[PDB]
Ligand binder design. Structure first.
Ligand code: SF4
Ligand SMILES: [Zn+2]
Ligand SMILES: [Zn+2]
Ligand SMILES: [Zn+2]
Ligand SMILES: [Zn+2]
Lengths: 351, 754
């Protein structure tokens, strides 16, 4: 009894530096009484959740946020590399209330205008969030879809309890034909999982486009405390970072340089990407009576696995989900937490 | 695929199949080997088109006996969908096998949809288009044009290039569908009408409307080659008896009688002028009557024959002179006998129905004019018109209609019924008398086509019961099976909304007008869908006039406003063109973002020929039930003959045909097994007749779906579409109910030979 991705294709190249733009709909549709508080406020909630999720897991990417109201679409965040701007924007939104209906075309076009200064290595994806049953366009739709996917921008949309095959067709266009991006839901657990997978870099079978280098340098922490002075907010900065060549002071941020305009991280972010470079073979649940390994966990120490024949119960799940390339165990919580947080296969890292 | 039914390779153009399809092919072949009729059910949710065409090509190419196949759709649109479908079948067949095709199979509808001449094309009424392509390319036009070169005569020149290149040979190889046929013919600036008309003697399959096989005035030019040993299918033949009794129908009204006075006086004028100028050729035609029916130029007419044949295909005919009518002036005399005897029969104070013979003997007492000469009305008229090489027909449309009338009434008896209502009560107490007349037995009209052909195939996406038709049309069949939709997933929720919000038992059969209880009931139902439903939703109504009263008083309600906030309304309208423009705009909108709604009559014209994909079709609603005795008693006497002839009483057939139209409109929403949506009915009566709903449809009806409230139904569709958007595709449960390529068919069936 398993519902598992049979082939976890990940050993290649996914979209890393993603210029992500969630779009929001704040219309009378988001009011309606089908979700527990509402669609609307719950969406604000899970959107904040995604802000943290994304900027954690994609801590080298950028973001701007746009909402839609009253047959009009409204940006709420300039392209920002500080999460809290998005966070407090979302706060300022939640208290504002939805009205009217989404002018989908205007949102698409605003986004189109936004992601233009993004270079090649910076990749372009928008993120619809939809709960309405209709749009309001002022401009020819498939016209703008043509422009969009002609400028190489796949989009992931998350509609609510319906289907709108224009969304599927537009996505299939944006996603080079192949479609998986019109994920809509039927439950709130379902909703958050949708988010969590929206976080990860997204490959399908990549169009072999330009692989361009990216150049940068690294700043250095400061020593003097009283010497408070800033050039990125022009405020007091009691100690921080120092552009490798431009040698300006920068308050703590992974941002691009504000003087000679070059990117500045340390190394950690590369390491997160590597954790998204070679994920591991899935821990296979060892065959029930043919496993007969040592009776505990390896990664943790979990002596439970069976009761040795209780006719039904023990003969159920001889749960020893152990790795593939290392074949070294790890209990169910160990499998979940390894594959979840620290993929870090020690048994496979061990040798 | 290239598989077998134990005897024939099958080049199925899809690697995939459905088990029901193999059931279909097996039983249909088992028929064809013993040519018969064998009424069946094939769900339209699967496109039986491909099953049909694939097996038919396999059978025709494989067995060397029947090189010709007849596939009768209902309309031109069904034909062209099948045309591109067969084109795909043929392209796949060539792709798999190389080139074994040598295949030419074409359809045909009319100049109205095929007159490649632009000036003629700009006209709108198909009768004038017919006459105008006649005159423009007439066996007479060419002559007087050629002996006398003048700008008086013209031609499409499409007939010219036809004559030049086409009528020695055929099209290159293609199955030129209306798209491909019209494109190719335009690139060759050809007359596709005459092209197919001449081509008839060579196509390996043929397709056309039911009418071309049903209206003997057009179902006349059938050759034995196209007839003798062809194989004949009917698809969506459910609503056929309508066409039968229509083909044998003739109503009247006396404004046309004034038009016919105009025409017949004009004929006095023409006979006067010609006979004074020259009666000699008229005497030539007198001796041509004296030699008989004059098939020498009454049937030997490559373009001449003026009046087509209302009678069955020349079976109910003789050949003698019409006695005294040899004189065309006697002829016009009896023409007036008719027209104005019709006029004196036109203004009875009340309704009167007539058997042809009863009123016929009546007329003889009133005016001792005789039946056998009377039949020759149409043919004599046509011949005299040709001998007058006339320049106009509009004055004589009434004359050809009356020719048809007299011919049938002098011809047909004891199955038909004249009826004379002195007004339309719909606008009662005004003069609108109607001398309507029609048949009552469809089996009669069908009988010649059954008589010619054994291997006849009937299949509609509605048929139930499979016995009603054998009763009505009195025919032998063998394998009368309905195919329950084998699906391991729901994919459709039909539900009977007997209870509204107020749980009021609902129907439109209360009346054709308003009763704000049911009115707001239905408005609430509608608008609640309007919110919850996504793009693509059409509900169907019992009657345009009823729907009209309801819609007007609903515009009076704000009930339009919320749907106007969400979706797009499209309404039905009597004008064919603007109805169609609404249709295409609906389609574009629903495929686009803004959801669009149509609403319509179960009898409505679109419900005849237009199918619905996932996009355009999500939630259909049968408000009330499509009954008709709102309208006239022609159906009353129809039922009278029914009962005294068939063991079927009124209510039985009223229910039967109402549910026929119901399922007829239902079937559209589904395209392929990735198809789904809502199906709702809104009336109390649908519980009693749960069993009259076709097999798969009834399977989708669990008794727990009966007489639901509308709010619970709202919930039902809520969860329903929540599910439907989801990719529950194990594809390991799809093998058994899709029979994956070349294997589960091979595996199961070659094992299933048990
Ligand atoms: S058949 Fe030829 S002449 Fe007649 S309408 Fe068509 S194009 Fe014109
Ligand atoms: Zn700063
Ligand atoms: Zn710098
Ligand atoms: Zn463990
Ligand atoms: Zn391992």
């Amino acid at each position: 009894k398993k519902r598992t991705a049979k082939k976890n294709i990940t050993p290649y190249q996914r979209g890393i530096i993603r210029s992500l733009i969630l779009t929001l709909d704040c219309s009378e549709a988001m009011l309606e009484k089908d979700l527990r508080p509402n669609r609307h406020a719950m969406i604000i909630q899970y959107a904040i959740d995604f802000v943290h999720e994304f900027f954690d897991q994609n801590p080298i990417s950028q973001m701007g946020i746009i909402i839609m109201r009253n047959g009009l679409a409204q940006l709420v965040s300039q392209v920002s590399g500080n999460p809290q701007d998005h966070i407090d924007a979302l706060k300022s939104i939640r208290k504002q209330e939805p009205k009217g209906n989404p002018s989908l075309q205007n949102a698409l076009e605003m986004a189109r205008g936004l992601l233009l200064p993004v270079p090649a290595h910076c990749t372009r994806e928008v993120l619809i969030v939809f709960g309405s049953l209709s749009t309001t366009d002022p401009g020819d739709i498939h016209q703008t879809i043509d422009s969009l996917v002609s400028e190489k921008i796949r989009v992931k949309v998350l509609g609510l309890s319906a289907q709108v095959a224009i969304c599927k067709e537009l996505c299939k266009a944006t996603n080079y034909g192949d479609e998986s991006f019109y994920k809509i839901l039927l439950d709130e657990t379902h909703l958050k999982e949708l988010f969590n997978e929206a976080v990860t870099p997204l490959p399908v079978n990549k169009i072999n486009k330009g692989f361009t280098l990216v150049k940068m340098g690294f700043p250095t922490r400061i020593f003097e405390d009283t010497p408070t002075f800033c050039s990125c907010h022009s405020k007091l900065v009691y100690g921080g970072y120092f552009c490798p060549n431009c040698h300006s002071k920068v308050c703590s941020l992974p941002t691009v340089c504000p003087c000679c305009d070059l990117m500045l991280i340390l190394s950690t972010h590369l390491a997160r990407s590597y954790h998204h470079l070679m994920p591991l073979k899935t821990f296979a649940e060892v065959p029930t009576t043919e496993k007969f390994r040592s009776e505990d966990c390896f990664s943790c120490q979990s002596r439970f696995p069976x009761x040795x024949x209780x006719x039904x119960x023990x003969x159920x799940x001889x749960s020893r989900y152990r790795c593939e390339d290392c074949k070294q165990e790890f209990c169910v919580d160990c499998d979940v937490f390894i594959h979840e947080i620290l993929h870090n296969c020690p048994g496979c890292e061990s040798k | 695929m290239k598989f077998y039914i134990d005897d024939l390779p099958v080049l199925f153009p899809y690697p995939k199949i459905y088990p029901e399809q193999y059931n279909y092919m097996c039983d249909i072949k088992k028929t064809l080997d013993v040519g018969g009729n064998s009424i069946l059910e094939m769900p339209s949710g699967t496109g039986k088109t491909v099953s049909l065409l694939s097996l038919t090509i396999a059978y025709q190419m494989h067995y060397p006996e029947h090189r010709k196949i007849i596939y009768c759709s209902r309309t031109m649109s069904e034909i062209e969908k099948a045309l591109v479908e067969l084109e795909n079948l043929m392209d796949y067949r060539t792709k798999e096998l190389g080139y074994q095709e040598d295949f030419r199979g074409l359809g045909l509808t009319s100049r109205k949809n095929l007159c490649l001449h632009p000036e003629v094309s700009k006209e709108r009424k198909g009768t004038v288009v017919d006459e105008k392509c006649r005159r423009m390319t007439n066996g007479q036009a060419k002559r007087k044009l050629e002996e006398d070169p003048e700008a008086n005569v013209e031609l499409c020149e499409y007939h010219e290039n036809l004559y030049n290149i086409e009528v020695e040979d055929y099209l290159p190889k293609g199955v030129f569908s209306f798209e491909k046929l019209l494109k190719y013919c335009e690139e060759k600036t050809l007359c596709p009408y005459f092209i197919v008309r001449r081509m008839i003697s060579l196509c390996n399959i043929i397709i056309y409307s039911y009418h071309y096989l049903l209206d003997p005035k057009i179902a006349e030019r059938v050759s034995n080659e196209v007839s003798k040993d062809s194989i004949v299918i009917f698809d969506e033949a459910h609503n056929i008896d309508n066409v039968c009794i229509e083909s044998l129908s003739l109503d009247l009204t006396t404004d046309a009688l004034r038009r016919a006075t105009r025409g017949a006086n004009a004929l006095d004028e023409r006979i006067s002028e010609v006979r004074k100028v020259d009666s000699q050729k008229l005497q030539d035609e007198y001796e041509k009557l004296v030699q008989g029916l004059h098939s020498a130029d009454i049937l030997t007419d490559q373009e001449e024959p003026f009046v087509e044949t209302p009678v069955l295909p020349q079976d109910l005919l003789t050949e003698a002179i019409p006695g005294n009518i040899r004189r065309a002036e006697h002829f016009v005399s009896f023409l007036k006998r008719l027209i104005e005897y019709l006029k004196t029969r036109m203004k009875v104070l009340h309704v009167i129905s007539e058997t042809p013979k009863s009123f016929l003997q009546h007329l003889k007492q009133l005016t001792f004019i005789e039946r056998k000469p009377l039949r020759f009305c149409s043919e004599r008229l046509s011949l005299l018109v040709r001998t007058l090489e006339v320049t106009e027909v509009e004055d004589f449309t009434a004359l050809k209609d009356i020719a048809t009338f007299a011919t049938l009434i002098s011809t047909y008896e004891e199955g038909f019924l004249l009826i004379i209502e002195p007004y339309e009560i719909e606008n009662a107490a005004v003069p609108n008398p109607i001398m309507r007349f029609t048949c009552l037995d469809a089996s009669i009209a069908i009988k010649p086509v059954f008589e010619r052909f054994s291997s006849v195939i009937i299949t509609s996406g509605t048929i139930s019961p499979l016995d009603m038709y054998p009763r009505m049309l009195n025919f032998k069949t063998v394998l009368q099976k309905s195919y329950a939709m084998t699906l391991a997933k729901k994919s459709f929720l039909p539900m009977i909304i007997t209870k509204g919000s107020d749980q009021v038992a609902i129907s439109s059969r209360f009346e054709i007008r308003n009763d704000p209880s049911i009115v707001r009931n239905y408005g609430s139902m509608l608008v609640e869908f309007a919110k919850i439903t996504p793009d693509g939703m059409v509900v169907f109504f019992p009657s345009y006039l009823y729907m009209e009263s309801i819609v007007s008083m609903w515009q009076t309600m704000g009930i339009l406003d919320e749907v106007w906030k969400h979706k797009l309304i499209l309404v039905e309208t009597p004008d064919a063109q603007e109805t169609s423009l609404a249709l295409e705009t609906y389609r574009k909108a629903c495929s686009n973002g803004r959801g669009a709604i149509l609403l319509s009559v179960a009898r409505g014209k679109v419900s005849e020929g237009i199918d619905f994909d996932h996009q355009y079709g999500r939630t259909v609603l049968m408000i009330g039930i499509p009954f008709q005795y709102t309208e006239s008693r022609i159906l009353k006497a129809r039922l009278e003959f029914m009962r005294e002839n068939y063991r079927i009483r009124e209510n039985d057939f009223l229910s039967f045909d109402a549910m026929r139209h119901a399922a007829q409109c239902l079937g559209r929403v589904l395209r392929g097994k990735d198809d789904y949506g809502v199906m709702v009915l809104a009336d109390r009566r649908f519980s009693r007749k749960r069993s009259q709903l076709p097999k798969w449809i009834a399977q989708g009806l669990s008794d727990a779906d009966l007489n639901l409230s509308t709010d619970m139904a709202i919930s039902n569709t809520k969860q329903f579409l929540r599910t439907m958007a989801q990719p529950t595709d194990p594809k390991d449960q799809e093998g058994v109910s899709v029979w994956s390529y070349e294997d589960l068919i091979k595996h199961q069936n070659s094992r299933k030979d048990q």
